[PDB]
Protein backbone atom coordinates (compact mmCIF):
# COMPACT_ATOMS: atom_id res chain seq x y z
CA UNK A 1 0.00 0.00 0.00
CA UNK A 2 1.39 3.40 0.62
CA UNK A 3 5.15 4.71 1.21
CA UNK A 4 6.35 5.60 4.67
CA UNK A 5 6.67 8.58 5.86
CA UNK A 6 10.68 7.74 6.22
CA UNK A 7 10.99 6.66 2.18
CA UNK A 8 9.31 9.77 0.58
CA UNK A 9 11.67 11.90 3.34
CA UNK A 10 14.37 9.29 2.08
CA UNK A 11 13.30 9.87 -1.47
CA UNK A 12 13.35 13.67 -1.17
CA UNK A 13 16.87 13.26 0.15
CA UNK A 14 18.22 11.10 -3.01
CA UNK A 15 16.86 13.68 -4.93
CA UNK A 16 18.08 16.98 -3.38
CA UNK A 17 21.56 15.39 -3.44
CA UNK A 18 21.42 14.75 -6.80
CA UNK A 19 19.82 18.18 -7.86
CA UNK A 20 22.34 19.87 -5.61
CA UNK A 21 24.90 18.38 -6.97
CA UNK A 22 24.00 19.00 -10.64
CA UNK A 23 23.32 22.64 -10.33
CA UNK A 24 24.50 23.87 -7.07
CA UNK A 25 23.18 25.25 -3.86
CA UNK A 26 21.60 28.64 -5.67
CA UNK A 27 21.03 26.66 -8.98
CA UNK A 28 18.35 24.68 -7.25
CA UNK A 29 14.76 25.64 -6.31
CA UNK A 30 12.56 22.47 -3.80
CA UNK A 31 10.12 22.29 -7.00
CA UNK A 32 13.17 21.05 -9.47
CA UNK A 33 13.76 18.75 -5.49
CA UNK A 34 9.84 17.43 -5.69
CA UNK A 35 9.51 17.14 -9.29
CA UNK A 36 12.56 15.05 -9.27
CA UNK A 37 11.43 12.71 -6.46
CA UNK A 38 8.11 12.25 -7.99
CA UNK A 39 6.21 13.76 -4.82
CA UNK A 40 3.98 16.96 -4.84
CA UNK A 41 6.17 20.56 -3.54
CA UNK A 42 3.49 20.50 -0.45
CA UNK A 43 4.65 17.26 1.10
CA UNK A 44 8.55 18.27 0.57
CA UNK A 45 7.89 21.32 2.17
CA UNK A 46 5.66 19.71 5.01
CA UNK A 47 9.03 17.79 5.92
CA UNK A 48 11.46 20.12 5.46
CA UNK A 49 10.69 23.48 5.12
CA UNK A 50 12.55 25.01 2.50
CA UNK A 51 15.65 24.33 0.41
CA UNK A 52 18.09 25.41 3.20
CA UNK A 53 17.30 22.74 5.68
CA UNK A 54 16.91 20.56 2.56
CA UNK A 55 20.56 21.28 2.00
CA UNK A 56 21.58 20.67 5.48
CA UNK A 57 19.92 17.56 5.61
CA UNK A 58 21.57 16.20 2.67
CA UNK A 59 25.16 16.95 4.11
CA UNK A 60 23.65 15.13 6.97
CA UNK A 61 22.81 12.15 5.14
CA UNK A 62 25.29 12.08 2.51
CA UNK A 63 28.31 13.19 4.70
CA UNK A 64 30.31 12.12 7.13
CA UNK A 65 28.79 9.71 9.80
CA UNK A 66 30.83 11.27 12.76
CA UNK A 67 33.41 13.82 12.99
CA UNK A 68 36.72 12.01 11.79
CA UNK A 69 39.15 10.80 14.77
CA UNK A 70 42.65 12.98 14.33
CA UNK A 71 44.64 10.92 12.01
CA UNK A 72 48.30 12.23 13.49
CA UNK A 73 47.27 10.99 16.42
CA UNK A 74 46.25 7.93 15.43
CA UNK A 75 49.12 7.02 13.21
CA UNK A 76 51.12 8.53 16.18
CA UNK A 77 52.34 11.09 14.25
CA UNK A 78 53.83 9.40 11.21
CA UNK A 79 52.96 11.94 8.83
CA UNK A 80 52.64 9.71 5.61
CA UNK A 81 50.67 7.22 7.34
CA UNK A 82 48.32 9.76 8.43
CA UNK A 83 47.85 11.34 4.83
CA UNK A 84 47.43 7.77 3.30
CA UNK A 85 44.69 7.56 5.69
CA UNK A 86 42.96 10.97 5.31
CA UNK A 87 43.06 10.54 1.44
CA UNK A 88 41.48 7.11 1.70
CA UNK A 89 38.80 8.17 3.87
CA UNK A 90 37.97 11.06 1.35
CA UNK A 91 38.46 10.16 -1.69
CA UNK A 92 36.27 6.60 -0.83
CA UNK A 93 33.68 9.13 0.45
CA UNK A 94 33.67 10.75 -2.61
CA UNK A 95 33.45 7.91 -4.87
CA UNK A 96 30.30 6.71 -3.07
CA UNK A 97 28.69 10.42 -2.98
CA UNK A 98 30.24 12.22 -5.44
CA UNK A 99 27.73 15.51 -5.14
CA UNK A 100 29.35 16.08 -1.81
CA UNK A 101 32.38 16.55 -3.17
CA UNK A 102 30.99 19.17 -5.58
CA UNK A 103 29.03 20.88 -2.80
CA UNK A 104 31.69 20.82 -0.09
CA UNK A 105 34.68 22.22 -2.50
CA UNK A 106 32.20 24.88 -3.25
CA UNK A 107 31.49 26.07 -0.06
CA UNK A 108 35.49 25.29 0.42
CA UNK A 109 36.19 27.55 -1.87
CA UNK A 110 33.27 30.72 -1.47
CA UNK A 111 32.41 30.72 2.39
CA UNK A 112 28.58 30.72 2.56
CA UNK A 113 26.36 31.39 5.76
CA UNK A 114 25.61 27.86 5.52
CA UNK A 115 29.03 26.70 6.31
CA UNK A 116 29.20 26.47 10.60
CA UNK A 117 26.03 24.20 10.40
CA UNK A 118 27.22 21.70 7.60
CA UNK A 119 30.79 21.59 8.63
CA UNK A 120 30.54 18.82 10.99
CA UNK A 121 29.27 16.69 8.37
CA UNK A 122 32.50 17.23 5.93
CA UNK A 123 34.39 20.31 5.89
CA UNK A 124 35.21 20.40 9.77
CA UNK A 125 37.29 16.87 9.00
CA UNK A 126 38.45 17.75 5.58
CA UNK A 127 40.12 20.45 7.84
CA UNK A 128 42.84 17.93 9.55
CA UNK A 129 44.59 18.29 6.33
CA UNK A 130 46.70 21.27 7.04
CA UNK A 131 48.37 19.81 10.49
CA UNK A 132 49.27 16.52 8.42
CA UNK A 133 51.37 18.32 5.92
CA UNK A 134 52.59 20.89 8.47
CA UNK A 135 54.08 17.72 10.62
CA UNK A 136 55.08 15.78 7.28
CA UNK A 137 57.26 19.01 6.44
CA UNK A 138 58.04 19.38 10.03
CA UNK A 139 59.81 15.95 9.76
CA UNK A 140 61.60 16.36 6.68
CA UNK A 141 59.18 14.27 4.64
CA UNK A 142 57.29 16.54 2.79
CA UNK A 143 58.08 19.02 0.23
CA UNK A 144 56.13 21.99 -1.23
CA UNK A 145 56.38 25.68 -1.86
CA UNK A 146 53.36 26.72 -0.26
CA UNK A 147 51.17 25.14 2.15
CA UNK A 148 48.10 26.63 1.32
CA UNK A 149 48.37 26.16 -2.75
CA UNK A 150 49.13 22.69 -1.75
CA UNK A 151 45.59 22.69 0.42
CA UNK A 152 44.07 23.87 -2.42
CA UNK A 153 45.88 21.42 -5.28
CA UNK A 154 44.67 18.56 -2.75
CA UNK A 155 41.33 19.33 -1.96
CA UNK A 156 40.28 20.25 -5.65
CA UNK A 157 41.57 16.82 -6.96
CA UNK A 158 40.50 14.50 -3.98
CA UNK A 159 36.73 16.23 -4.24
CA UNK A 160 36.09 16.74 -8.03
CA UNK A 161 33.01 14.04 -8.47
CA UNK A 162 34.26 12.24 -11.51
CA UNK A 163 38.04 11.67 -10.71
CA UNK A 164 37.84 7.91 -10.96
CA UNK A 165 37.20 8.34 -14.63
CA UNK A 166 41.00 9.73 -14.50
CA UNK A 167 42.47 7.70 -11.99
CA UNK A 168 41.85 4.95 -9.49
CA UNK A 169 41.08 6.06 -6.37
CA UNK A 170 44.33 3.75 -4.31
CA UNK A 171 46.59 5.26 -7.22
CA UNK A 172 45.31 9.34 -6.44
CA UNK A 173 46.08 8.53 -3.24
CA UNK A 174 49.88 7.23 -3.66
CA UNK A 175 50.17 9.77 -6.51
CA UNK A 176 49.33 12.59 -4.10
CA UNK A 177 51.67 11.29 -1.43
CA UNK A 178 54.14 10.69 -4.03
CA UNK A 179 54.24 14.46 -5.21
CA UNK A 180 54.69 15.56 -1.90
CA UNK A 181 57.45 13.33 -0.72
CA UNK A 182 59.91 14.05 -3.81
CA UNK A 183 62.29 15.83 -2.76
CA UNK B 1 81.83 32.90 -18.61
CA UNK B 2 80.63 35.54 -21.24
CA UNK B 3 77.67 38.31 -20.50
CA UNK B 4 75.66 35.74 -21.82
CA UNK B 5 76.68 32.67 -20.32
CA UNK B 6 76.08 34.85 -17.04
CA UNK B 7 72.68 36.09 -17.58
CA UNK B 8 71.44 32.27 -18.78
CA UNK B 9 73.05 31.15 -15.66
CA UNK B 10 71.20 33.79 -13.54
CA UNK B 11 67.58 33.14 -15.33
CA UNK B 12 68.29 28.79 -14.63
CA UNK B 13 69.20 29.50 -11.18
CA UNK B 14 65.85 32.23 -10.58
CA UNK B 15 63.72 29.71 -12.38
CA UNK B 16 64.83 26.77 -10.17
CA UNK B 17 64.88 28.78 -6.97
CA UNK B 18 61.46 30.61 -7.53
CA UNK B 19 60.12 26.83 -8.57
CA UNK B 20 61.21 25.71 -4.73
CA UNK B 21 59.95 28.62 -2.89
CA UNK B 22 57.51 30.68 -5.09
CA UNK B 23 58.29 34.52 -5.24
CA UNK B 24 58.22 35.48 -1.81
CA UNK B 25 60.13 32.11 -0.44
CA UNK B 26 63.50 33.57 -2.76
CA UNK B 27 65.72 36.00 -2.44
CA UNK B 28 67.93 37.74 -5.15
CA UNK B 29 71.14 36.05 -2.81
CA UNK B 30 70.25 32.97 -2.96
CA UNK B 31 69.35 33.38 -6.62
CA UNK B 32 72.83 34.81 -7.14
CA UNK B 33 74.47 32.24 -4.98
CA UNK B 34 73.03 29.43 -6.98
CA UNK B 35 74.23 31.41 -10.19
CA UNK B 36 77.58 31.23 -8.74
CA UNK B 37 77.70 35.12 -9.23
CA UNK B 38 77.69 38.33 -6.73
CA UNK B 39 74.48 39.85 -5.94
CA UNK B 40 75.55 43.45 -7.84
CA UNK B 41 76.04 41.33 -11.15
CA UNK B 42 72.68 40.02 -10.77
CA UNK B 43 71.53 43.48 -10.36
CA UNK B 44 73.50 45.05 -13.13
CA UNK B 45 71.85 42.40 -15.65
CA UNK B 46 68.20 42.30 -13.88
CA UNK B 47 67.54 44.96 -11.71
CA UNK B 48 66.63 42.81 -8.63
CA UNK B 49 64.02 40.34 -7.65
CA UNK B 50 60.89 41.51 -9.34
CA UNK B 51 62.74 42.11 -12.78
CA UNK B 52 63.99 38.85 -12.62
CA UNK B 53 60.85 37.19 -12.05
CA UNK B 54 59.27 38.68 -15.29
CA UNK B 55 62.21 37.93 -17.19
CA UNK B 56 61.73 33.86 -16.05
CA UNK B 57 58.62 34.24 -17.18
CA UNK B 58 59.58 36.16 -20.45
CA UNK B 59 62.06 33.52 -21.08
CA UNK B 60 60.24 29.76 -20.07
CA UNK B 61 56.64 31.46 -20.46
CA UNK B 62 55.20 31.48 -24.13
CA UNK B 63 56.91 33.72 -26.89
CA UNK B 64 53.82 34.99 -28.08
CA UNK B 65 49.83 35.23 -26.96
CA UNK B 66 48.12 31.88 -28.11
CA UNK B 67 45.65 32.33 -30.94
CA UNK B 68 41.82 31.65 -29.26
CA UNK B 69 41.70 27.50 -29.90
CA UNK B 70 38.11 27.48 -30.20
CA UNK B 71 38.15 30.07 -33.37
CA UNK B 72 41.60 27.37 -34.96
CA UNK B 73 39.03 24.47 -34.11
CA UNK B 74 35.82 25.68 -36.38
CA UNK B 75 34.25 25.74 -32.48
CA UNK B 76 34.74 22.04 -32.06
CA UNK B 77 34.97 22.31 -28.39
CA UNK B 78 37.17 19.14 -28.33
CA UNK B 79 39.44 19.64 -30.47
CA UNK B 80 40.11 22.93 -29.18
CA UNK B 81 40.63 21.31 -25.48
CA UNK B 82 42.95 19.09 -27.22
CA UNK B 83 45.31 21.94 -28.77
CA UNK B 84 45.00 23.51 -25.56
CA UNK B 85 46.15 20.99 -23.26
CA UNK B 86 48.85 20.33 -25.83
CA UNK B 87 50.27 23.37 -25.78
CA UNK B 88 50.39 23.62 -22.10
CA UNK B 89 51.21 20.15 -21.21
CA UNK B 90 54.50 20.34 -23.38
CA UNK B 91 55.21 23.86 -22.40
CA UNK B 92 55.13 22.64 -18.65
CA UNK B 93 57.04 19.75 -19.34
CA UNK B 94 60.00 21.67 -20.95
CA UNK B 95 59.89 24.17 -17.90
CA UNK B 96 57.52 22.43 -14.83
CA UNK B 97 58.85 25.52 -12.71
CA UNK B 98 57.09 27.60 -15.10
CA UNK B 99 53.65 26.02 -13.70
CA UNK B 100 54.32 26.00 -10.34
CA UNK B 101 54.95 29.91 -10.56
CA UNK B 102 51.51 29.91 -12.58
CA UNK B 103 49.82 27.90 -10.35
CA UNK B 104 51.10 30.12 -7.13
CA UNK B 105 49.73 33.13 -8.89
CA UNK B 106 46.27 31.81 -10.17
CA UNK B 107 45.53 30.49 -7.01
CA UNK B 108 46.95 33.68 -4.83
CA UNK B 109 46.62 37.00 -7.13
CA UNK B 110 49.61 39.51 -6.29
CA UNK B 111 50.73 42.87 -7.59
CA UNK B 112 52.90 41.11 -10.24
CA UNK B 113 49.76 39.78 -12.57
CA UNK B 114 49.27 42.21 -15.10
CA UNK B 115 53.17 42.04 -16.17
CA UNK B 116 53.42 38.28 -16.17
CA UNK B 117 50.09 37.51 -17.53
CA UNK B 118 50.48 37.61 -21.42
CA UNK B 119 53.42 35.13 -20.92
CA UNK B 120 51.33 32.48 -19.60
CA UNK B 121 48.07 32.93 -17.24
CA UNK B 122 46.32 35.38 -20.23
CA UNK B 123 46.09 32.37 -22.86
CA UNK B 124 46.15 29.83 -19.73
CA UNK B 125 42.52 31.74 -19.37
CA UNK B 126 41.27 30.21 -22.19
CA UNK B 127 40.09 27.11 -20.39
CA UNK B 128 37.05 28.91 -19.26
CA UNK B 129 35.18 29.29 -22.65
CA UNK B 130 36.45 26.14 -24.30
CA UNK B 131 34.56 24.09 -21.12
CA UNK B 132 31.58 26.46 -21.41
CA UNK B 133 31.37 26.09 -25.14
CA UNK B 134 31.71 22.03 -25.18
CA UNK B 135 29.15 21.72 -22.24
CA UNK B 136 26.89 24.30 -24.58
CA UNK B 137 27.28 21.61 -27.41
CA UNK B 138 26.35 18.88 -25.45
CA UNK B 139 29.94 17.49 -25.53
CA UNK B 140 31.30 17.80 -22.18
CA UNK B 141 29.34 17.13 -19.15
CA UNK B 142 30.49 18.62 -15.57
CA UNK B 143 28.83 19.88 -12.69
CA UNK B 144 31.01 22.82 -11.68
CA UNK B 145 32.78 25.24 -14.19
CA UNK B 146 34.62 26.73 -11.58
CA UNK B 147 35.80 23.27 -10.36
CA UNK B 148 36.18 21.98 -13.33
CA UNK B 149 39.08 24.49 -14.22
CA UNK B 150 40.50 24.74 -11.16
CA UNK B 151 40.68 20.63 -11.72
CA UNK B 152 42.57 21.12 -14.58
CA UNK B 153 44.20 23.84 -13.22
CA UNK B 154 46.03 21.32 -10.58
CA UNK B 155 46.57 18.31 -13.12
CA UNK B 156 48.67 20.37 -15.73
CA UNK B 157 50.53 22.78 -14.06
CA UNK B 158 51.00 21.45 -10.26
CA UNK B 159 54.42 19.65 -9.72
CA UNK B 160 55.62 16.55 -9.96
CA UNK B 161 51.70 14.89 -9.93
CA UNK B 162 52.52 9.70 -18.94
CA UNK B 163 51.94 12.68 -20.92
CA UNK B 164 50.54 10.70 -24.14
CA UNK B 165 47.65 9.59 -21.57
CA UNK B 166 47.27 12.70 -20.11
CA UNK B 167 45.54 14.68 -22.43
CA UNK B 168 43.15 11.65 -23.62
CA UNK B 169 42.21 10.93 -20.11
CA UNK B 170 41.20 14.49 -18.68
CA UNK B 171 38.91 14.97 -22.01
CA UNK B 172 37.69 11.29 -21.37
CA UNK B 173 36.85 12.59 -18.14
CA UNK B 174 34.77 15.14 -19.34
CA UNK B 175 33.06 13.54 -22.32
CA UNK B 176 31.65 11.24 -20.35
CA UNK B 177 27.85 11.27 -19.80
Known amino acids: HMASREQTMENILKAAKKKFGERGYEGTSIQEIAKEAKVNVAMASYY ?12 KKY ?11 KNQFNPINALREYLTVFTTHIKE ?14 ESARLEKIKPYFIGSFEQLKEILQEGEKQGVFH ?5 HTIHWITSIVLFPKFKKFIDSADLVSRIISALTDK
Do not use: D, H, R, W
Not at 64 to 70: I, R, T, V
Open 97 to 110: NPEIGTLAYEEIIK
Open 63 to 73: GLANELPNFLE
Open 144 to 148: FFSIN
Open 48 to 59: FNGKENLYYEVF
